[PDB]
Symmetry: D2
Amino acid sequence: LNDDATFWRNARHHLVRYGGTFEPMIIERAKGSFVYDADGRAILDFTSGQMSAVLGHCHPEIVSVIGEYAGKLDHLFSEMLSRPVVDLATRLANITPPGLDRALLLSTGAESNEAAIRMAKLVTGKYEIVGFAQSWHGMTGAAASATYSAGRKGVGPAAVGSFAIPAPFTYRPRFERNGAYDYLAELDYAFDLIDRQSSGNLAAFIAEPILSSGGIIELPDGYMAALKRKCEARGMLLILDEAQTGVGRTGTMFACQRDGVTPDILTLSKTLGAGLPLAAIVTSAAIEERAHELGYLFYTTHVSDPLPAAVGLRVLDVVQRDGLVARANVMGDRLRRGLLDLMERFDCIGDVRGRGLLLGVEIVKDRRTKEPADGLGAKITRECMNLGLSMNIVQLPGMGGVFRIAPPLTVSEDEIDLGLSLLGQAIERAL
Amino acid sequence: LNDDATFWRNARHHLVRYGGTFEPMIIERAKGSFVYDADGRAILDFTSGQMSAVLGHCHPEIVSVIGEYAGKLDHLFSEMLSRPVVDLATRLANITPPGLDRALLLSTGAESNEAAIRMAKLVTGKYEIVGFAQSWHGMTGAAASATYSAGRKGVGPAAVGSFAIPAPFTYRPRFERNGAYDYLAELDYAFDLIDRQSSGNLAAFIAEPILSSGGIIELPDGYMAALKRKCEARGMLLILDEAQTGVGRTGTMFACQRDGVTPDILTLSKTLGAGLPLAAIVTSAAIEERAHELGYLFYTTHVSDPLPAAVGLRVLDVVQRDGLVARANVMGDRLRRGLLDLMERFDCIGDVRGRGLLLGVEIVKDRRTKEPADGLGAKITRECMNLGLSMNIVQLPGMGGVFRIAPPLTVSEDEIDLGLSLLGQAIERAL
Amino acid sequence: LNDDATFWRNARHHLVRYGGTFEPMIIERAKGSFVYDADGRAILDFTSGQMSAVLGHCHPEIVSVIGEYAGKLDHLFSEMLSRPVVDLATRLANITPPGLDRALLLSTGAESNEAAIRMAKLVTGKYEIVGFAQSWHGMTGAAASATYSAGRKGVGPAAVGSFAIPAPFTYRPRFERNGAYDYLAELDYAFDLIDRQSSGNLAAFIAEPILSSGGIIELPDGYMAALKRKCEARGMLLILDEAQTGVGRTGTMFACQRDGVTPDILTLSKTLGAGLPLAAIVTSAAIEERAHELGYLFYTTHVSDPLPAAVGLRVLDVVQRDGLVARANVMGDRLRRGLLDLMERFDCIGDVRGRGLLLGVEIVKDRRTKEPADGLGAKITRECMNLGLSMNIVQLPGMGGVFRIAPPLTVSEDEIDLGLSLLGQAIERAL
Amino acid sequence: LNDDATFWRNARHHLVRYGGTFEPMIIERAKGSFVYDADGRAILDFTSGQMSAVLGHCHPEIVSVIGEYAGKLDHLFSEMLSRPVVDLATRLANITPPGLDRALLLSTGAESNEAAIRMAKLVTGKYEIVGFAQSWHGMTGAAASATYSAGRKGVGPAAVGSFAIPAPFTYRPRFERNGAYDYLAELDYAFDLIDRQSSGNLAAFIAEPILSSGGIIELPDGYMAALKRKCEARGMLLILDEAQTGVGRTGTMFACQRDGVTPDILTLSKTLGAGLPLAAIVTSAAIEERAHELGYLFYTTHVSDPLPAAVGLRVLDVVQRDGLVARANVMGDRLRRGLLDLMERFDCIGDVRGRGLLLGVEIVKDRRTKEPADGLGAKITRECMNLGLSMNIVQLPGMGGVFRIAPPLTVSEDEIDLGLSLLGQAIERAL
Ligand SMILES: *Cc1c(COP(=O)(O)O)cnc(C)c1O
Ligand SMILES: *Cc1c(COP(=O)(O)O)cnc(C)c1O
Ligand SMILES: *Cc1c(COP(=O)(O)O)cnc(C)c1O
Ligand SMILES: *Cc1c(COP(=O)(O)O)cnc(C)c1O
Ligand SMILES: [K+]
Ligand SMILES: [K+]
Ligand SMILES: [K+]
Ligand SMILES: [K+]
Ligand code: NA
Ligand code: NA
Ligand code: NA
Ligand code: NA
């Protein structure tokens, strides 16, 4: 049983609680799109873990690579360069758009946004950072000051120069320009305000191409390009946080490739590591040169470590070969349609959005009002669990609960159909 | 050759420079206390990498464990608990002193200090943090605001409420109380000042038991206990950053055990991971409970991940069995004496300090003045390299260059004697 | 002549420039609504000085009072109370609405807003302050952080916790709610954003009932009451800055009396002093009691000084007797109409707004586009001068230049008609 | 009686408490060195009011001048220059040292320090301000962030970049350099620390030549010059706050003239106004030019107002004619000696310091320990009152209560002898 009293005793006595609530099970092993409990039950992992397992759990090539390296090159002094590092840096240069030339290899998402935010502050001579009101950029210092979806209260002042603008949200429009939702005008109206407050030190803007924690909010058409232009006018850098979207999840290698807007700094994380702690930042040579002349510094224990770099190169090689970016569009199309059918069946589904294999289902009480469904989400989530489907719901202010669905890039037709059912049943038995 | 033009071309073109200067070699493989270049040359690794490889490179048990796990349990959703996590948490509870009960498993040193600093801010209701003028706590936001040894300039304002006090340094005393160096009085004098500046919101004090980057500065006797009392009086928490000192390097499991002062939050990193990205914070149940009632949050992609937790448990198991904590004292005594002999021979060595296998050699021009040796360090470091000894020198203001010597806990008598020689030769041929 | 070379020499050599550009004349004397140059020319003072001379220059009762006091009670130690102080405090209590009980007598507008902002921070336990994007609250520290109409750049960071919301502006509507300008919805949209950014420490909101420097922007109907409710919900205090509006200028003793919304702290200045340095804050007893228990402190050299208090009491007595609050409505109606006639005549006048004797004329290129008239303002202002009419124009972003017209409360029918002409001529000869 | 129940009723009901405790009397009139209660009792004013009445209360020339002006030129629009302004500016240029050329005429002490601090931030491009741990610079925003003697707690964060260094205090030495009190070394030790914390943005240092609220702490010999050099090295400006010391009180026109160190910005206040609200800043042309090119701005209602400027010119004229700067040394010598005699008589007097007519008496329990006398000060102060001597005691941490004695510059031999007695009696009857 998952009920092993010694286990839970020790857990209750020695673990720090950091948010949420531990599942009431013991994960014993994991493989492909499934995780298995102490009882041998296979739970279908529809969130790819913590939105990371782009290649699934324990992908045989990841295992080879981790193996080749643990016994050969593990961790090195920060000034010692090696092969996997130089190859990963390079690979990244070639697969990101033009204009993205040099990489810094680190360990976490928040660490990568810190490094980006510090380089922009260095390069510009400024310190103010603007982000979206419903962003998620990490728990550490600066990443936390640019995060607005959560954790902002009770922990002291934020970093100086922190401002936020609303994210453009089509589902629940709030800004109107003559009859309709004018997200560009919203943008201008927003920027006017910032301009009115700035102390004359705007350094950068960080944005998620698709707000994940913010409820899978997709940046509408022509927004990014407009955003980029707002930054250009002001002398600000644009940092794109592609932690959940980079590496094929939305159907392109990087989401920034859909819009066609290439950022000043691009940050990668979750999917680059496929489960491991690897992260990076990619920038243009000009900025890097500049940052170097000014003495940029971001030295950590694990920057440029052989093992991680090596794992990342493989994730990339596999995605490349198996044409997983394309599978994301195909399987993504399959999941989407299924969800819409569900929508046809239940009034509680108010919206289905996202791209590729990064989809969102907004639970609502009724479509007319679009009134948030108070705790019906928790029900559905409870019911999914019982049936063996691992989901995750985010819930924000003035929004309905949103299920973040993000299966592995290697999901099969069957696994998709399967979750689609479980989902159906869980919903069915929760009204 | 290490000279492979394609390699260096790609490196010059696609790597971001983050501080220092890349060694002019290609590390092809690593094992035990040595790293090997593209030419097969074995460089003796006297800094344990980035001060982490407590068990050396590619320690066969680390390899087993990484192996058992990559193919079994890799990364899980942040709410899903597993075995290696619960066992590591527990193990940590039992080997740290009494008073240290609950752990949070993360990825980097800076991340662990961020989590600690955020919990103290939460728990106290305050935000001011005090640290030493020559500290090193990491590159991320808050860890960076409490770091004073470097990177403070040109990147924007620091976090509000940041203060620093001088660290007690015996080698170059600066505060005098009737005839001698009264470090306690220095402490009081320092705190008076802080008190005079505080806005009434002192939340915590972070300290390294031994300032590593600050030039291997050991906290003198009775200091910590006095420090702890200064915190107690003010309602402040004491966070001990044992990233370089924890896990046997100084001859005790944790340095805080020598002083006998147990901190409010203890942070672990480099040596806990032995090369990998694993980190943690250990706190008392009272604080944790408190932090939980107030809604503490520190949710990341890799908190509680099976693989890392698993590696850490092994590091711990090995240290435990092989009695490496004791070896650190024995081999440490051997290295020390050797260094002192060197001191006898060359006037440039002005001081040898540290504990266990975390030693420091301060290069000076002459002992009488104790005048810093301008670039003689770089010479010695250059010469070490040529001979195959990997050293690292830190250089701060009003200090001479300090060699940080921190070999693996598994070093052999021979390897120690060996580096000791190379060191001798490198010094000899650099005057 | 105004051309006295010794004068201008000394002026060029020994005066610090603090903004704007000195008039090219020497004011030799002043009386009623006029100022006189070195040549004896009478310039009609349509701005009441620096918007202060509510009773005109050198009003014979002010002269008596200053006289009675200079030779009797001038300045006292801050703990020594006297009669004029206690009477002024009292008078203020009785003429401000219910709910406004205790006063603090100081010297400047900015000083009064500082005292208000510090009391709210004290009382709430919080520090964030919200103001309008086009406010003016003074040059000193906190008053400056809540000022957004100007001086925000090149002087260092602002105070932490500073946010601004747009002011509701009817002339150039920007927020639309189904067809029309929904200023209340603008308000809600604004507050949502603040809420999304606040670190959980909103302490107060300062607002001008009529934004003077912001171009005589009147807070639309039902706004204040809605504003007050936004503050109430959040636990924030509402500080009303009635420096230019208090003391009868808009037709009521205090503008807050029109809306019927009484603030938490009310601040007075310019018009209270009628030219002298007197200022005050009026609050409720509850807040004051609270502030006292917590140790509120605002001790200055001139708090509670006999002379100033005494002058203020008289301003108040005169306004009261001569029924100047009513004259403000009557003469104000006369000036208004005249301005509208002007509007009929010249296309450049795009809007005429304000209340009582606090009017604004927005110069524009053409009414259809409402395109700002680039420097036509400076022309008109130049031409006014030549004719002997002293005006003042404020010019902000995305706005046309605005003439701030605010004659004395004691203006005569003739003086009004007169300026109205000069204005006509100045405009006429500047296209 | 002073007991008028209507008075006290109204006072209890309508005055805001801003610190301290109101005297239990009604000041009805004031003249020369005395104030008179409702009963006709003459209290000898030994603090010159709020340390301002350099020429006493109601000095007949001040009365003339206030009179000539109230009826002639009172308040003008901020861009309109006049005679008294230009003459005062000039006079200030000529009587301050060389190197001090241009003046800005304002209203309060804190306002003047705000203007100074903003100009330095403008001129340098930096924002960090350093002050003494026991300073007093005013209640407003920035003046308050540089104040450390009081009001720092419970009101929110201070301005970013605020640091403080200890003031050199001879009476209770704390820093020792080989045997003795090395205040210069203290200074260096202090600055090292600042340097270690600065984010690379040190803009200025504000200092009081004699810390008044800090307990009449005189800056020891050669300190200022050393201080100035510390600023020069770092590119920082030195702002001297001569609010209590300027205008002859210490025996020179400005205290900065004793040391011979001329500051970058000099600020004047209390004594410049002699009781009225007048204040100024004097700077060098270079800085002013610079500040002008960069758009410096400090526009208030009362900057450059005719009346105040005019009063100030007279204070200055009188000081000049009557040779009051010299009287300050002579009468100051008389008061001093008297105090020392007192010291001879009572063990409670532990120290007598200061300069000219700005003296301090530190009450202590016994000279050997120099143990602060707990509330014996309040006794003495109570007893003085009863006898008709108005004193003021400041009390700080780790210090004994300090009586600030600062009679008018026009005190007579008799009045001095008189207070000296009352003081004797009050002390006598309070042990
Ligand atoms: C998860 C996430 C991060 C932070 O990564 P961590 O490894 O959890 O620190 C940053 N940005 C985005 C957009 C993320 O989704
Ligand atoms: C190395 C180090 C850290 C930071 O760890 P990283 O993994 O480099 O972020 C923090 N504290 C101390 C004392 C360290 O030595
Ligand atoms: C003028 C003004 C002030 C500042 O008064 P000063 O005496 O110039 O410091 C503050 N608030 C408002 C609304 C003002 O118009
Ligand atoms: C009194 C004082 C001030 C402030 O003057 P206020 O008019 O009270 O604002 C500033 N600095 C010093 C040194 C003072 O003594
Ligand atoms: K490394
Ligand atoms: K996890
Ligand atoms: K006073
Ligand atoms: K003026
Ligand atoms: Na690229
Ligand atoms: Na323990
Ligand atoms: Na009232
Ligand atoms: Na001069």
